[PDB]
């Protein structure tokens, strides 16, 4: 039991795809140990938690876990909840002698303006200690205090191409055979995201045998 999706994960900021103008700036930031909040925007799927944990990674070295913490922000317990959680990660030093430690807010944008706020003061009550990287689908669904507190970051959609090149180094490093009308099919069922298709080229590769269109609708038959 080994999930793809995670072996396969960018391990630094080189290594996520479809994003340059993001990753560029982004690189500089890692170059000048450093970086303000951040607001990360865009589509689902665009690989704005895999950035975040690229940049992470890329800040810490390989003691990363130990400074860096994911959470949804539009917990079903309220925004009180989750700034409870970042309360007690905030409150202890960064360890190893890291700088600051990293927390990374998804969905931030499904917050009401009230939540926004609360979670702006929270936000502010650790500026020194701890650094936001807040995910979103939409700037415009941020609150204004937010935007202007963070360096933001606009994430597009993954031409087809960036996906099939990434696909493709996937099955060289594990092997996979697939015909260029199964490579086709697996785009297809994508979507547009490399989450569902990763996850789908390991079930059709677990078969054992050549991938082509069909491997690619029994397997998502069976999603
Ligand atoms: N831009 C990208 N470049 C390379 N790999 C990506 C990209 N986006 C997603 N992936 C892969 O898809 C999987 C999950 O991506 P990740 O960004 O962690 O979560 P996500 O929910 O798909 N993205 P997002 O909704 O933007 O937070 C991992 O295998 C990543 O390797
Ligand atoms: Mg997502």
Redesign the pocket.
């Known amino acids: 039991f080994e999930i ?3 072996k ?3 391990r630094t900021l080189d ?5 340059d103008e993001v990753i560029q700036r982004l690189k500089g930031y890692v170059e000048r140990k450093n970086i303000p909040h951040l607001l ?1 925007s ?10 975040a ?1 690229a940049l992470a990674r890329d800040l810490f070295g390989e003691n990363w876990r130990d400074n860096f913490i994911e959470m949804n922000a539009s917990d079903e317990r309220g925004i009180d909840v989750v700034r409870h959680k970042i309360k007690e990660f905030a409150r202890t030093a960064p360890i190893g002698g890291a700088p600051f430690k990293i927390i990374f807010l ?1 969905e931030a944008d499904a917050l009401t303006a009230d939540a926004q706020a609360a979670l702006r003061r929270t936000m502010e009550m650790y500026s020194k200690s701890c650094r936001f990287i807040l ?1 979103c689908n939409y700037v415009s669904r941020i609150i204004e205090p937010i935007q202007s507190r963070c360096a933001v970051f606009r ?1 597009k959609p ?1 031409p087809k191409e ?1 996906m099939k090149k ?1 696909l493709l180094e996937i099955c060289e490093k594990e092997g996979v055979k697939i015909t260029e009308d199964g490579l086709e099919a697996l785009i297809y069922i994508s979507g547009g ?3 569902k298709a ?1 996850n789908a080229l390991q079930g059709a590769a677990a078969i054992g045998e050549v991938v082509d269109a069909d491997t690619i609708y029994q397997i998502t038959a069976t999603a």
């Open positions: 793809w999706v995670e396969y994960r960018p290594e996520v795809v479809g994003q990360f865009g589509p689902p799927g665009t690989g704005k938690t895999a950035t944990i998804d995910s994430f993954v960036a990434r995201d490399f989450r990763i």
